[PDB]
Amino acid sequence: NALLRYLLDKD
Amino acid sequence: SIPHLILELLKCEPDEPQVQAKIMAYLQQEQANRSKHESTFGLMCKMADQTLFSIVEWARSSIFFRELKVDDQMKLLQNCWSELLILDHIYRQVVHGKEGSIFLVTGQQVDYSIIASQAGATLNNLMSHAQELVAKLRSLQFDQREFVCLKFLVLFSLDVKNLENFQLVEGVQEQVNAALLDYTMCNYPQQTEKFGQLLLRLPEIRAISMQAEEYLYYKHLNGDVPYNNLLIEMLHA
Ligand SMILES: C=C(c1ccccc1)[C@@]12CC[C@H](NS(N)(=O)=O)[C@@H]1CC(CCCCCC)=C2c1ccccc1
Known part of the structure; x- marks a missing residue:
């Protein structure tokens, strides 16, 4: 799940 | 009194007006940037999509959850994202719900007769079961403190396997329960x-x-x- 990991990592 | 733990849970709740207005603002630009040329079920998919974004941001900054590694955070959210959408929906009707209408995350009020005509047999049946939960929770005087507790019980689910730090999830499940x-x-x-x-x-x-x-x-x-949004991605995994 690329978008989920992004939402948890984005600054 | 209120257990200190429940106070800590409350301090992670976003300002409900801010997330509602933010989602409303998003959907207004979507249709505004559409032409006069070219559904309602689709309009809900995007509402539920943007509600997912806020749900992710809530958990991300929430106590305990913010101490999990990203791999663990994804496993928990992948397991419960639909539950939080439903629970969020149910609580909105308990608070703002009027008989015969649906309150959406944008604050809009929609009549049942309009939804029922388009949703279809399955979704209508699922919504009615949710309303039965609304009536019950309203008769119990379901309040905000109880709401945030259930949110964390759903989030820190014991059904989630292959966690690196299942002990934290187990403890949160237990201390929130107590x-x-x-x-x-x-x-x-x-x-x-x-x-x-x-x-x-x-x-x-x-x-x-x-x-x-x-x-x-x-x-x-x-x-x-509508393809490839966050909603569809959570369904894939
Ligand atoms: C899971 C949902 C959903 C996802 C994709 C498409 C449609 C709905 C929600 C979850 C809440 C969300 N609401 S909204 N529009 O404010 O984002 C959604 C709308 C709603 C009530 C009205 C539905 C009628 C559609 C024509 C849902 C729902 C579904 C089953 C049982 C209970 C509720």
Whole structure:
């Protein structure tokens, strides 16, 4: 799940 | 009184008006940037999509959850995202719900007759079961403190396997449980059955959410979804 990991990592 | 733990949970709740207005602002630009040329079911997919974004941001900055590694955070959210959408929906009707209408995350009020004509047999059936939970939770005086507790009980689910730090999830599940048990005692001592009646809604919420997941995936396979958004991505995994 690329978008989920992004939402948890984005600054 | 209010257990300190429940106070810490409350301090992670976003300002509801801010997330509602933010989602409303988003959907207004979507249609505004559409032409006069070129559904309602689709308009809900995007509302539910943006609600997912806020749900992710809530958990991300929430106590305990923010101490999990990203791999663990994804496993928990992947398991419960639909439950939180339903629980969020249910609580909105308990608070703002009027008989015969649906309150959306943008604050809009929609009549049932309009929704029922378009949703279809399956979604209508799933929504009605949710309303039965609304009536029950309203008759129990479901309040905000109990709401955030259920949110964390759904989030820190013991059904999530292959966690690196399952002990944290287990502890949060237990301390939130004990705190809700103590909250309903002090603040609702006459309701000996309130605690139990709140926990019994979580499996019902789970069942509605899993069924909702399966149906929306069916509609995606069938080609009835705005594609590639976060909603679809959570259905994939
Ligand atoms: C899971 C949902 C969903 C996802 C994709 C498409 C449609 C709905 C929600 C979850 C809440 C969300 N609401 S909204 N529009 O404010 O984002 C959604 C709308 C709603 C009530 C009205 C639905 C009628 C559609 C024509 C849902 C729902 C579904 C089953 C049981 C209970 C509720």
